[PDB]
Structure formats: structure tokens, C-alpha cells
Write a protein that binds this ligand. Sequence first.
Ligand SMILES: COc1ncc(C2=CCOCC2)cc1S(=O)(=O)Nc1cncc(C#CCN2CCN(C(C)C)CC2)c1
Length: 858
Amino acid sequence: RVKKLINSQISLLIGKGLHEFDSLRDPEVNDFRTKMRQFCEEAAAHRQQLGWVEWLQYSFPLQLEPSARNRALLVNVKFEGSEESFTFQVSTKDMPLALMACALRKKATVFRQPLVEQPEEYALQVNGRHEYLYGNYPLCHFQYICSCLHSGLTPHLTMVHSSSILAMRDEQSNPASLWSLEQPFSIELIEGRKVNADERMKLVVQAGLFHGNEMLCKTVSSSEVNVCSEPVWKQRLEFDISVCDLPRMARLCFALYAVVDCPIAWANLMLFDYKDQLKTGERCLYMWPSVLLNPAGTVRGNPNTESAAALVIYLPEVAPVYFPALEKILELGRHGERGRITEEEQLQLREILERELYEHEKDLVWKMRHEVQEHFPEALARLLLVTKWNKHEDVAQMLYLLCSWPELPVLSALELLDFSFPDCYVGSFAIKSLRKLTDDELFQYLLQLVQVLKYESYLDCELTKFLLGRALANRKIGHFLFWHLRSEMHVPSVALRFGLIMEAYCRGSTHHMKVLMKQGEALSKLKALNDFVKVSSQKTTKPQTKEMMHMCMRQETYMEALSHLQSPLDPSTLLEEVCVEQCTFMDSKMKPLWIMYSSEEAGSAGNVGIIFKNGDDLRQDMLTLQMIQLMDVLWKQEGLDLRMTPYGCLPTGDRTGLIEVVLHSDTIANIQLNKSNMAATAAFNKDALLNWLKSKNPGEALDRAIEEFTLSCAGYCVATYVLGIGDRHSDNIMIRESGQLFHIDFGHFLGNRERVPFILTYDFVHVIQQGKTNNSEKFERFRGYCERAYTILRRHGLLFLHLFALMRAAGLPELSCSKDIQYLKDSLALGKTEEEALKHFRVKFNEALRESWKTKVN
Ligand SMILES: COc1ncc(C2=CCOCC2)cc1S(=O)(=O)Nc1cncc(C#CCN2CCN(C(C)C)CC2)c1
């Protein structure tokens, strides 16, 4: 009775009927669903018995300042079921417990009674948010308390008792031998079906065996056969590699095309199956349309069988042959010769492991494999790349050393997740080194780890199991894992994989399924409302379309679907009462909607907005914003706060997503229109930005507003330089009423292919110099902020390179080659010393200042 309801709710949420999984009749698919349902149900049961503070860590994980991983402060505290409140002055050095004990002493006098309840029995909720303050941390270490200190504002907190937290826990419960086959590997290319090509040309089928990116042997080609719907070959394609040497993760890649170079289609398959057995019999390869051989592409067929070209191939029977077990492998690898040559050979080893290498260096690194294991364990990735994956004796010797390799730092593990390391044991070892990842680090890299699933050869994998277990133990990780997979359900290549992961997650959290369905319902109404706006705007004037939008939002179905929800941009932010009168849309092509919200419980923190966008792909905006946010995190860990504005951006479906509204901000273009009869009207357009800051920050407040601008300007000058974000104009640069500058519209990065120089804009130099023509004291403090920021990022150059390497899996047009990653290597000057990189940065900066002065001359 309940299972039918749950299965139908899951189908609605994931945007794919669960019947379609059963209809495929695939054992791998069914075994993933049964095994992952059990694993996710175990996590759910574990959770229901968690202690009330452990339930807070699951649902409301702490939001701390990067540096946390004296001064007076006025706090307002109320109790859960109360109307009255208490305002008291505490210190930024005090912990929540002291503030809770202070709230209980203020309440004991108000209610004339010695209280039984101790501070230890409570937690402090941020008013109107899914956010809590708890644990041994001083108040200023929390992100909510710190943001309140900058904005001037007073924190509003609520004392929630343990019994009420336990009641939430309960309300949210889930309802009640291969090595003896030395023959050569070969296949039979039988025929092709539904093929479309120019009849003047001839069809060719190119095939190659790969272990990730490297070929296990040279490619082979079919005999040229005349173009037609059903081409027929019936021929053996013999590859030079023994069937016994085929590594476990070997994949046979296909490419059909026409020749006189006209690509048609590609398809890949794993030579071994998910249960480790060698593949035999006939296989029908439903091909993917091209734009030659594509190894990184999926190893599963195009689900569109009614229109896809299908290559028919035969995998011959070499004898049921499974891949040897790890004990057989470790026995074979247990025998070898160790490294034993002079300190002059070890000097060459030490030089090449601390600096792409020549063939004699590969023979040196492999010979000294035992010494790299014990004296340079972090060089595992170099050694794995020199390993001959096309010789089974060499794979067993490598796996023997890997099986007792010490756990590596997170930075090294993020490299091992790359597609250039397709061995399952290597991936398993990499995941083992990532378990020590804090929920905050995991969240930071969650987008990349989701893309790595696209490289996975099989459905059931250590990465999937790891991502699902971290999602079920932290509701914020769960929320974003769901949205990263949900937003890709319109992509045929990942819909099966992602749909199965979301169904499994849903088995672990039935309550959270209902929470996300409530978000999905709101996004449906937003698509329909946006569609109406697009239509109405091409016929009537903006005021008339805005009121028609408001009339549509005012219907019961819209008011119910759009209110009282968790923000998909941030589960801590509750979107309560939609303020229809404040809602509007922009005039650009896709007419993005601005939906305004408010909450009487939250006060000023409940006044939030979201932007629904349908028509543009938001993946790259998100990635760029996340990179900027990573920068701000890294700068803050070195004590450098550059007043960044990392607003949320989240794709949610096909060319659909949400952007977070940053209120009290306008574009440079709108400020520079120099409207008549304003608090900012100027004698010279050069003054407009500075007059606008003066109007927003009167008297003594201007000084701090100018410093906010300088700091954020320095951060964005460096961030856009490093990331090669060009096409910067006055309409994609915004400024906050506090002085903070930020960037929007990230359609182009990594120089995509010009080399984006450092940009210094005169208008911003004029604000930095406080309105003065010459102000070296203010200008050079800004060049210092730029230099500190640049030099802190270079020290993390490998973290950006590893993260961007994992991102090549996303299929982003401006992030699909070594040329794109090369761009960051140049911008961060990673091939140089710090002194040399700083001189090059100064020369880039001085060139930007000279360019800025071509506008200052006129
Ligand atoms: C790429 O799209 C976006 N990215 C970030 C924001 C973000 C914008 C701000 O928050 C951060 C993200 C907004 C958009 S958008 O889709 O809205 N397009 C867009 C383009 N160029 C400029 C703008 C303005 C603006 C200034 N606003 C003044 C106040 N106005 C009110 C009265 C409704 C709305 C327009 C708006």
C-alpha cells in the first residue's frame, strides 16, 4: 500500500518511471538496485537511532568560517514557543553554551523559577533558517555570526530543546584460468544496421583496445565496404595482444565512418562483464552519433534503439573464464627483483620524481618501483603511468606494491580518480584515501566527484557507494548530490546511472524525497510561468506582462507550489511567503524570473530571492562560481578576506537552473547611466560610481565601503585573470550597497581561444584612489592585495589542476582538452619559482595599468 505510493513518488521526483528499470531485464541493473537498496536502508535505520546532537549534525551540519576548520556582540534570543525575546551583549569569543546559559538566567528571572533545564539540553537555531549554532566553537567562528558582524546586523537565535529536535528525528523516519590463454585477442565484425551516409563513399570500422587513454595495442581497421543501410563485413579483426594479458578494465572501442574523413558513430564495451567474466557470444552495439576513436565515452549502448546505427560483433569463446582473484594476482606479484643500483642512479630518480618523461626514464622508474613505494609514496601516479598495463606480469607486480601502499593525502587521491587511472584497485585505493575528507571538503569537490561517475565502467562501484554513504550521513551532501544527478536526467548516456543512484538515495531518505518533490513541484510551476512570460512579452508591454505574471502566480496552485519550501540553492534557506508584488523578470532573451520571498520568523534574513532561468545552460556558470568560492576559501585560510560574493548557481534540469539573488546590488552599467534627479547624479561620469557609494554609505560609512570595493576588486581581478574569463563589460559586473564588487554571466573562461590579459578598469581605479587622480598609498595597497591573492593561489596550483582535470568528464565545450588545462598552468605560472612568477605577474599587472591609462589620458 505504501510501496506503491513511494515507488510512484520516486518516479515523479527522478523524472523517470521505475518500471523502465525492470523492463530492461538486465541483471547488473537489478543487482545494483537490490544491493544499493539494502545499503541505503541500513544508513536510514542507523540514523533513526542517532543521538539528538548527532541528528543536528546530519540535518543541520555546521557552517563554519574557513579559518575555524575580545569584542562586544549584541544577540537576540527567544525560546521555541515564545513571542517575547531577550537582547543581551555577549562576546565574539564566547561559545554557544555560555550564551544559552545566559538565556536561561534571563528566563529564570522573567518566569520567577530556578530552571531544571540546563544549557547542555539545547541548541541555538538561526531564526527562520535550517541552520543551527552548537559545539565548542566561539561565536565569531560560525558563518552566520561572522556575516552579522560585517553587515552590522544583530543575530536572532532561538533556543530549541533536545525533545523538540528528537520529535523532528521521529517525524522524519522512513516508513515502518585467464592466464593460461596465450592466444591472440580478436573479434568478428559481422554487420551494421540503420547506417546513414553519402552513397558515393565507402564505410570503414576502426577498432582499438584501451586501458583508459592508452592503447593496449595498435588500432585495427575493417575492409572498406560500400555505403548502405545494412553494411556487412563477416571478418576477423585481430589485435596484437594475448587474451591472457587483457587487463580487468580493458575496453574495446569502435568507430564507424565514411571515407572517399566523414565520422558517423562510435561505441565502446568492456571486455569483461560486471561479475568479472570474459565476454562471449554476439553483441549488438547501439552506436552514439559522432562529432575519431572515443575511449572516454560510455561503455553502454545508445538507449534510442529505434534510430541508432547498430554494429553487430562476435566475441569468440576462448574455452566461463573469469578475471583471476586478487589472491591469485598478489601471489604472482609477490615474486620480483628489487632496486639495487648506485646513488648516481638514485640521483636521477630523485630529480624526475620532484619536477612527462623519456623512455629511458620510464625503465628507470619501473626498475626502482620498490624505492618509490617506500621513499616517494606520493609518486604512485607517475609509476602507475609507466606500468605496462598490456602485460599481466607487470600489472600483478604493480598491484602487489599498491596493495600495501600507505594512504595518500587528499590532493594525491583527487589525481587518482582521473580517467588516466582506470584500474579498479587503483580507484578503490584512491577512494580509501578520500574517506578522511571532511564534509566541508567533500562538499567543495562534490561537483567533480559527480562527473567522475561518468568515467565509471560499471554501475556498482566504490565511488557510488562512497557518495551515497556520505549523502545519507549529511543532508546537505544528500541535497546537492540529488540535484547534480537530477539536472542530468535529460542526457541519455547518464540517465540510467543517475536514475539508479537517486532511487537508492530515496530508499535511504523517504522524508527528504518528499522535501525534494516539494522543490521539483515549484520548479515545474516556474517553467510554465516562465513559458507564459516568454509568450506574453513578445505581444504586450512589460508592465502588462508583469501583472499577467502576478495574476498567474496568485492562483491557488501557484501560491501553494511556490511557497514554504527549502531553497534548492541552499537547504539552510527557507523560501516562505512569495512576495508576488516584488516578483519580476529581466528583458534578456530568456526572460529570467526574479521570485521574491519573505518570512516573519526570520526577519531580514528571510527577505531572499531566487532567479529561475530556462533557455541557457548554467553548468559553466556554476563551475566558475565554485572555483571563485574555492579561491575565497583558500585566501581566508591564509588570513586574507577579499569580501567575495559567491552567490549560488544551480542547474536543476534541461537548460534550466537557479541563481541566488544578491539584494541591494546593481550593475556598473545601471549606475553609470547617470540618471537625472538621483542621490548620485554627477558633473563627470567618472564620479557616478563614487557618488552612488556616498549616497548608500553616508559620512563615516564611505571609508569602509571604499575598502570593501578595493578588497573585492583585487579578488575579482585575480580570479578573472587566473580563470581567463574575458568579455567583461559594465553590464556583467555588479556592486553591492556595501561597496562590494562582483561578477555575473560566466559564458566564457580559460581564454576561450585568446589569452585574456590582466584587466584594470579606470572606473574602479578611480574608486580605489578615493576620487583622487594620484593616490599611490591607496593604489599600491590594492597591488599588494592582488599580489597576496595571486601568490596564495599558485601554492594551490595542483588542487585547481586536479579539479579541472576531473571536470573534463562534464562535456563542457570550453573544458575538453589539455589546451584548456594548459591555460591554468600558464595563468598560475606553475612551471616557475615564486620570485619568477611574481615578476611575470607584476609585468602583466603593469601592462594592465598602462592599458587603464589609455582611458585616463582622454
Ligand atoms: C547570467 O544571469 C544572471 N546572473 C547573475 C545574476 C545575479 C544578479 C544579482 O544577484 C546575484 C546574481 C542575475 C542574472 S539574470 O539572469 O538576472 N540576468 C542579468 C544580466 N545582466 C544584468 C542583470 C541585472 C541587474 C540589476 N538588478 C537591479 C534590481 N532589479 C530589481 C529591482 C528586480 C533587478 C535587476 C541581470
